[PDB]
Amino acid sequence: SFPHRNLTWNDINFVHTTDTHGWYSGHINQPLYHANWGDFISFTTHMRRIAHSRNQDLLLIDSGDRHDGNGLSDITSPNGLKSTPIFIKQDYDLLTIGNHELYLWENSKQEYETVVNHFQDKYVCSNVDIRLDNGLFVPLGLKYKYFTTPIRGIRVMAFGFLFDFKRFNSGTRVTPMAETIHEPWFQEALKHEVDLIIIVGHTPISHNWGEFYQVHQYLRQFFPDTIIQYFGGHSHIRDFTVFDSLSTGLQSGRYCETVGWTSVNLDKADLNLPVRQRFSRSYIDFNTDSFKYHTNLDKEFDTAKGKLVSKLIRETRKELKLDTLIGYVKTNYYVDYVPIDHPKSIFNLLALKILKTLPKSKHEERITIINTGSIRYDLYKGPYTIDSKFIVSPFENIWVNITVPKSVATKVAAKLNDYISASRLKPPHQYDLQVQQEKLPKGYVTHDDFGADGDDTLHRAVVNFPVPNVIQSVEINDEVDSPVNLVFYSFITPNIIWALKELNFSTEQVPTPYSDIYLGTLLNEFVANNE
């Protein structure tokens, strides 16, 4: 029930999602994001119908990462078995892959067989290949799409680019977009005549990231006065970036908190329009107040399709037992509203109380290290459910260890916290922390290339502290040099090995299994107060 900023519509309109991470049920602990996928389906039904009645085109676009962060997607093996049927009920026009569809073979195979198969001609991946059962590799989806819009006959070419991701499973291949552009097939794709180029990508649109920029230079050589619109993701932020007067990028947040909006005027390049006149953007809070406002409906908002999807969500959550209560949390614990050494930090809670509950021998000295990016959400006070485990700690990381002297072990976390890591260890939004009344709800106030007013709702701006790459839980008996078990996630092995080399510690000791108990299980037992 808030005052809203108006959307600017235009020739072609874009509705954008990214980094949904299975949040199709809506948010219970942040009611500004209460709406579910059904409501969003009602929303876009009307917004398409509205656009068509105004002789305008509208396209829905998704930039990937559709699991790892929610019970709806994560409770099943493989991930997404019950959330995908919900996701694909939305009528996307273009979509691409994120890195979370690529960590495990089961996920990549699932993606190819369900999502790509469903959105056969709409799923575009230019730089990711998948292994067929016969051992040969094929593009995971289309390498590009050439099409014309149904209302205004706009001739558009679309490409799809994943960021330079290193940890893909070996049943897939990612090629950096900087190399993809010099490949034979790409030059052949550039021979088309187009009114509009769409670059969808699970890639941050930030100029500090810099991958889309290199693609932009190359495309400007061949298409010097074509409108090129980018849709990015990965880094979990609302963002909008100007490449030039004929080119911008939109990024639409995370966790179904945000529906991104962009409209473009497609009058000729000769007219020399100001970029702010040609393009407009908005970030829409994922709630029905925002959805009802922008469609101008209330009583007539709910569609029969939307209502069916919302019912399917409730039926799915019930059957997965997601709202089954495990316990109660006494106080709020935050990812980054306080720093990691503050008592209301979820990282302090982990370092002081939870990580210590990993089983230990009587005389054992250990230091346990985790990356901050393994925690995906705040731990809110009140009821803690089955779903809460996956929302906070979705990853099925087991624990390995190496035994090293205390003199070395005590230096490792500081070494890792110093350092450009091959893969990002922090929560995704923690790399854009450059910065520039009581009635308003708490939410985002985005500062992008078009200024500070893109958010569809006036908010009291939320603030984050920087967090380190890793935190440690130290369990030693004294300050005396002794053997210490350095305990960590199997996947941060390369980082530990790097740190040990930087501390000039040589060993050909390899990490050995330490514990199969997931962090999420330790969290459950801590909350329940028994085990």
Q: Which residues bind Na ion (CB under 5 A)?
A: 447
CA distances from 460 to 145, 240, 257, 445 (A): 41, 20, 16, 7
Q: Looking only at residues 465 through 524 of this chain, which bind Zn ion when binding is defined by CB under 5 A?
A: none
- In 3D space, the residue among 243, 144, 242, 138 whose CA is nearest the CA of residue 194 turns out to be 144
Q: What backbone phi and psi angles, to 5 degrees, belong to 208?
A: -65, -25
Q: How far apart are CA 123 and CA 97, in angstroms?
A: 8
42 binds Zn ion (CB under 5 A): no
SS3 370: strand
Name the minimum Å distance from CB 448 to Na ion.
Answer: 5
Give the nearest distance from C-beta 305 to Na ion in angstroms.
Answer: 35
Please state the closest distance from residue 178 (CB atom) to Zn ion, in A: 19
Regarding 62 and contact with Zn ion (CB under 5 A), the answer is no
234 binds, among Zn ion, Na ion, none (CB under 5 to 8 A by kind): Zn ion
Q: Which does 307 bind (CB under 5 to 8 A by kind): Zn ion, Na ion, none?
A: none
Per partner kind, with CB cut-offs from 5 to 8 A, the member of Zn ion, Na ion, none near residue 99 is: Zn ion
Over its C-alpha atoms, the chain yields an Rg (Å, rounded) of 24
* Contact (Cβ atoms closer than 8 angstroms) between residue 306 and residue 42: yes
Residue pair 472/371 in contact by the 8 Å Cβ criterion: no
Stretch that binds Zn ion, among 8-16, 99-107, 508-516, 522-530 (CB under 5 A): 99-107
According to CB under 5 A, which one of 57, 65, 74, 111 is a site residue for Zn ion?
65
**Three-class SS of residue 462?**
coil
Q: Which does 447 bind (CB under 5 to 8 A by kind): Na ion, Zn ion, none?
A: Na ion
- Residue 363 marked ligand-binding: no
Q: Which of 99, 263, 372, 457 binds Zn ion (CB under 5 A)?
A: 99
> What strands lie across the sheet with 137-139, from one edge to the other?
137-139, 128-131, 172-174
| 8 Å CB contact between 474 and 495 | no
DSSP string, 63-96: -S---SS-HHHHSSSSTTTTTHHHHTTS--SEE-
Convert residues 230-249 into a mask of x (bound to Zn ion by CB under 5 A) and - (unbound): ----x---------------
Dihedrals phi, psi of 50, to nearest 5 degrees: -60, -45
Identity of the residue, 265 or 423, whose beta carbon is nearer to Zn ion in the bound complex: 423
In the bound state with Zn ion, the residue whose beta carbon lies nearer, of 64 and 71, is 64
- Separation CA 189–CA 212 (nearest Å): 18
Comparing CB distances to Zn ion, the nearer of 38 and 98 is 98
Judge whether 459 is annotated as a binding position.
no
38 binds, among Na ion, Zn ion, none (CB under 5 to 8 A by kind): none
Instruction: Pick the closer one to Zn ion by CB: 292 or 426.
Output: 426
With binding defined as CB under 5 A, does residue 21 bind Zn ion?
no
Residues near Zn ion (CB under 5 A) are 65, 98-99, 234
Annotated binding site for Zn(2+): 19, 65, 99, 202, 234
